[PDB]
Specification:
Organism: Mengo encephalomyocarditis virus
Strand content: under 5%
Radius of gyration: 20 Å
Subunit structure: Interacts with host RAN; the complex L-RAN recruits cellular kinases responsible for the L-induced nucleocytoplasmic trafficking inhibition. The complex L-RAN can further bind to the host exportins XPO1/CRM1 and CSE1L/CAS. Interacts with the protein 2A.
Distance between the termini: 53 Å
Keywords: animal viruses, positive-strand RNA viruses, cardioviruses, leader, protein phosphorylation, casein kinase 2, spleen tyrosine kinase, viral protein
Largest sheet: none
PDB class: viral protein
Structural class: little secondary structure
Number of domains: 1
Bound molecules: zinc ion
Protein name: Leader protein
Amino acid sequence: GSTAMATTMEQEICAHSMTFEECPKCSALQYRNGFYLLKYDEEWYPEELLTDGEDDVFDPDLDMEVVFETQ
Ligand SMILES: [Zn+2]
């Protein structure tokens, strides 16, 4: 959405300030903002990802213990 759809985009919009999963719960009478709106559980502005480096946090200085097929 090029234009501002309920102020913030990509986090979706339903009835009143919640989550995508939470949306069927509120299709309630209030309809204040957007029950899908508060959270679409999309990461916003991850500094770690933006900064060049290792793929995962656990990747640097990872010491792996090998069980040598011993159960
Ligand atoms: Zn709806």
